[model samples]
Target chain A: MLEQPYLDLAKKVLDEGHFKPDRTHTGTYSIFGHQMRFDLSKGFPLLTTKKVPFGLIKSQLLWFLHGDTNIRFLLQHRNHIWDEWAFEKWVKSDEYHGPDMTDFGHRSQKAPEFAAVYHEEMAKFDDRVLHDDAFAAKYGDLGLVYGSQWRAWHTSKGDTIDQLGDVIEQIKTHPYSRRLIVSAWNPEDVPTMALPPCHTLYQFYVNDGKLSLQLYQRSADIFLGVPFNIASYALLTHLVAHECGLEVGEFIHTFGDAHLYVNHLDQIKEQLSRTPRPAPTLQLNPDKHDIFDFDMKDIKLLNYDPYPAIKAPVAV
Target chain B: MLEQPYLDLAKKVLDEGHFKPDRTHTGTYSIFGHQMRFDLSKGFPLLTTKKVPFGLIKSQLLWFLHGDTNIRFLLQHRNHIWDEWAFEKWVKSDEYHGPDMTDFGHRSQKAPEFAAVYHEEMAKFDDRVLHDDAFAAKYGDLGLVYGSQWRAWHTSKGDTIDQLGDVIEQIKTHPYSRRLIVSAWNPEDVPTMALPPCHTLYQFYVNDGKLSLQLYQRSADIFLGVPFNIASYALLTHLVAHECGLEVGEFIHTFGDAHLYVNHLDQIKEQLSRTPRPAPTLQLNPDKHDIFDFDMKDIKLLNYDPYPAIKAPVAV
Candidate 1:
């Protein structure tokens, strides 16, 4: 029942949402303005109705904390979630000459032959990114992503500000300050970026020795992304609280446009029918108090029993 | 009633909020992660329980729309809401040879003798800012305020980007685009700002020929600020919808730290005890399609019946 809010959100979108066309050409059942509060004191908010890959979430978040924008680290960890965005850039550049990979995102889904060729080319791209330092440096680096925005925000005077570091310091010094915030939505870089940030801005609130975080995500892909986002921020709140010598409070997720892609309706309904298991308990390495020093092995989830993974096609 | 959400928000904060001290040293009954949606289709969201100054809101918003950060324009319209901020800067600089104005904000509130001196000095500061062109340019400009951040966002490349202009263009060209957002929380400039934007960011959503807006305010002084904020954004949604020739939708307000100063608890309770009246209808000049081209006279609030204005001391 702790995860009912996520299921309720999916149901509401499917039932009363507007039919809108998106950039990806996959229509969405969308609603504007939604909020979900997950009390971390109860347990970690990783969805229990459907099995979520906690490993992928941990590695990706640690990458952002380490300020690593290059995809090389993700590839080294064998997480290929972000491979397509990097590969899309490589194929569009003059350096690539293997296949006519135009509109590969849509074409790969519709045409099996194209999907096969696309997978092979993507495999090669990943291999080169992992092996060749020059290629990875050029193509693997996702400029102005969350990592750069959080850890090294570019300034007008050619300087960089560490927003996350400063915010953590604020929490440690002034626990009740309302100004503890980290923003990823930079108007200067939005127009030129590959994908504008969906987890746009987040703020931290501390009260009675507990730390809570609220994320204002401008857009959400409910089925594929929301589950991951919930657990990610919950983990971030935990890590930050640990560093500041506080307890976990809650993770409040708010949205501007929360939508369910039409393709995921059946998957969501199937997910809704299943009963939620007991929420998982997350354990971070007791030795590491600093969030940036955290590694994959340092974090673990206990008793994460769920029904099963429901397969759904990604909107992208 | 249409204005019930605003009243409900005030009631909730007063009932079960954490007592926290703020930057202004005024303690607050604080609640984090709250949201309210006002249906613009029903009526304008101006509060009926207490009379809010619609004229001041109009002039201030128009100043922001014109991308003007100078306080002289505000003075010209007989609005002195921002004069103190500008005066604070002038009295602190070496060019000023006035009275000892150190810690003038809190000192004036507590001491009647000092309040008289502060008031006289503030009047003199305002007069010079209005009449003296050179002085106004040097002191009246509150750089990195809403007007500057919304209109001309500073970039690392020494060029500015017009975020509001681009977002309006996006609404016209791509109505359903989730990226129709304007952000004011720039990490690089926040450290040096007198008051970082409380109304942090906003996004527009278009569906079924209606335009809606959702604002993410990181910090809100509910008793004094929320009423003005609600009407301001509602008016903005109407203006944008009118420009695009679409019907107005809802205005969803989301908050990070929504609180009422402890000093205003009785005022809020008194406000909640009153019965709601019919909401007001906003009138915008039909001929004026562009938001920037319209002046204060073009905006009017028709039939706003309300109780007497509630008085409370501002936190600053």
Candidate 2:
């Protein structure tokens, strides 16, 4: 099955990857120049071996598609994937009167007491983002992130380029054009960004009425990040294909620094030990033609029975 | 032996690629995602199956390193590879009073009569660019190319960022950084560019005191462009490693739309039939610690024995 590629990559890294220290204090077993392909025709590439969270992936992708950089959309959908970035901004701001939340990411993960305080602060932050428009505009927005870079890249000439919209238009008009690419790695924006885009660039290809996508991710935390990444792009390919009236082909994930955090070794091993079940099938709402207009209800995963989730500490 | 990965990719595309029409009006046998790696620690990856031009690659790379946007630097070194792009600008401008040169690229290749005139005009254009300062400044510069994008990316706040310089500094300070990337794929510039950057983004990885680079090329003309690209990035990695006082590692080239033009099929088959000779060794001047200080003479290729050069028509 196509899902074997993901398992094979995990095994390869675990078996032979070199030890390397990373930005996050947690070290990694890493390798470079790894490529994995998932044939969407076989089925949706949600990891059945470890019970990947498809709900969060869908909501997050929808948020990006909407070109909404604020954490409010994600908060409203109960996807806390981007909450920390927003909370970090709020905690560091001058107006913040919260407890000492300095180095909250590592402190929260390491100390149970600090974790509770962080959770309380983060809950308050999330509530403000969801209900308070003024606060959401001030702190909840992550300027020039994937959503902004993909849909509205701010230009030097005081204009915004809709890269995702243009690429989709190109797919429908000229499917064979080699210039069908959406890049999120902006040189001007990277220096100031808290976390520069890990999914740097992606390109779409059309052949024989089937659409394919290849994502070039610069950094991947294999245990904590890769499952969501794989399914996210797979769903993106499916959505773009549906919009262009074509069948799905493959989702190719290429990495520059693919690593498994040292702290997550046991979790990865446990997940790898389990056998993969039949891959899930993705059902996109036929009524929804535009990817930008998709919502949580428009996408569904069918028969995603899998082994229990293996918990692992995120390396910030 | 490390060059075998490149050979395998070519063979794979030729055997199994789908036929697709492209913007150049040249049909191509294309595949979506392909990867090839060359271990620079073993030797330089100048293809042994064909006599690839090392001098042109060196001069072009040096020009890029110098942040040179004008074609004068290239023409001064007897490299005409970028002349057409510059001349296209000249002929299409109001100042140009030369012969009718509309669609000169395709016309020059297709018709021998038009080719002679185009060649003469191009020679005149090259002379003016090299000898005339004002003319060179006005017409010779190919703006927003690799040279400009790598060295001086324009910022939103009316500033320019030096991506290459910053990336090298990161290598020296934080070698393990996965965010050590230099991106040429600026979304704002893609729309108006004659040809977008094909070698879109690249990231550097340092492991075990060895430096590795992986280039994510969005589109690759496999037969014509891939050979030069492989050598260019390999040399780039070597230069960067040398600057950082580290040993050479691998140059992993990952492609999005890798294709062979239909006309190059016979040439590719001929290349595959030939046996690979001993790989060449690259020697950079030891006195040069900074990559920006490298000249054409600073780099040398040793013991490059290869099959005779196979010529093919370029798909303009």
Candidate 3:
């Protein structure tokens, strides 16, 4: 019942969404400009219709809060989400001795021959980064990812600004402040990026001793991405509110172009047919006041009953 | 009617909106996140509940399109909307020889004696900005404003990126792109600003040969500012669609902190009691394809019937 808004959006897009060609060959059923609110007080908005991996969400968020930009940390947690981005870098470098991995993303998915070689090289790359310090320092790092931008925003004066630090302090000192915002969209770095920030900006609000957040995401793959996005941001809202000594409030997710890839349409319809169960409860360690100090052990989700997980193809 | 959505939003905020204190001493009846959609084909969303100044909106938008951050051009066109920002600078400078204009924004509204001096000083400031070339060049320019950031976004490498130009080109070539965004909230410049951009960022979407726009405004004074904001963005949508040779589609207005100042409650209720009229139509000069080349003479509004404007105290 708590995740009804999200299901409504999925249904609306399916019935009335525009069919548009995207950058990739996979077209989309998209409806531009949408907002969904998750009242965190009711329960965490981890969708009950499908089983989402909470471990991946927790590890990734912990990585961001700690301001760690290296894929080595993620690999240590057995998280492969960012492996491809790092692998892409290492294969292009002169030091790489493996077979060519040109256009590996699409090729590997389409051609089973390349998939075997791609998996082999990626494993090797991940291992080397974990064991070899200098090698990891060179290619393991994603120089301008969310963690880097959130903590050390580069300025023209050759200094870095801690946007999160400033915003958190604003929330504590001036609870009524309307400018409590953190943004990751840097026009300076956009051209160089293989993929720009999808969640462009977020703002924090304080009212009645509760902290609320609103995120403006430019694009979202509703079927695969929105589930993770909702849980991740809901966790973020909880963590930040805990640090600021306030109760949790709503987590408002606003999207610019929310789309379901054509390949994922059947998966979405399957999801829609399923009835939603009770939302999970998020519990945080009472001792950890600073979000940066939080780990996987410090956060937990309770009563997460859901339907079986559905597989959806990636647009990339 | 086209304007019902706008009125509904106002009503919703009044009835169910939470009461909260804001940065100013005047508290607010606030809502965290809200979105309203206007189909441009229905008509221009210039509110029929109240008369909105299309002339001022045109001049201001044209100023932004030209990449002009100076208020001198605005004053030259008899637009005084941005005069206070320019005046605040001149009054704070070492060359200023007038009476102390400290806290003039709030003070002038509250104190009768200070109001006269504030008016005289502001008039003097406007006249000089209109006539004196060097003075206007020095103080009339609001660096890092919406216009400046929209057009010449500063990079860490001491160069600027033309975001609007790049986005426009992207629209022509890659209309399906989800990253057609222009941001006005520059973190590097926010600390130095007295007021950050309320309409933080906007994204353009193209589908079915119709162009749609969505704006993420971080904070808005719903009673005073929302009317202007609705018409301004709607007009902008029409102008850009015209230039792109696409039919106008929708203008989705999204908000972060949508609030009415406590003093504006009665004025808002008065608006809700009145029945709405048929929305007005917007007509842009067809010959002028480029939004940058257009002027006040190039845009027109027709068929606007509205209740009288209600007065309310500005929170400043």
Top-DockQ candidate index = 1
Give candidate 3's TM-score.
0.98
- Better model by DockQ: candidate 2 vs candidate 3: 2
| A1-316 per-residue lDDT for model 2 (tens digits) | 5578888989989898998986777788999989988889999888888877888888898889889898888888889988778777777768888687877877787676785887878888998888888989979888867888888888888888899999999889988877888988888768887888899889998878899999999888888889889999998999999899999888999998889988898888888777788888888899978888787898888888888988777776
Residue range with the least summed lDDT across 10 consecutive positions in model 1 chain B: B106-115
Off by over 4 Å in 1: none
DockQ of each: 0.86, 0.86, 0.82
Tens-digit lDDT track of model 1 for A1-316:
5788898899889999988898887799899999989999889998888888998998899899988998999999978888888888888867878877777876888676775788778788888889999989999887767899999998888788999999999888889977998999888778888788999999999977889999999999889999999999999999998899999888999998899998898899899888888998988899987888888998989988888899978875
Q: Comparing chain B with the reference, what is the TM-score for each candidate?
A: 0.97, 0.98, 0.97
Deviation (Å) of A240 in candidate 3: 0.3
Candidate 2 — which residues are off by over 4 angstroms? Answer: none
Question: For each candidate, what is the lDDT?
Answer: 0.88, 0.86, 0.87
Report how far residue B44 has shifted in candidate 1, in Å.
0.8
Task: Give per-residue CA lDDT, model 2, range B1-316, as digits (tens).
Answer: 6578878889889889889887778899889888878888789999899888998998899899888888889999988888878777777767888778777877887776775888778779988888999989978888877988998998889787899998999889988888888989888778888888999888898988999999989889888999999999999999998899999889999998899998898888989998888889988899878888777788889998988998978998
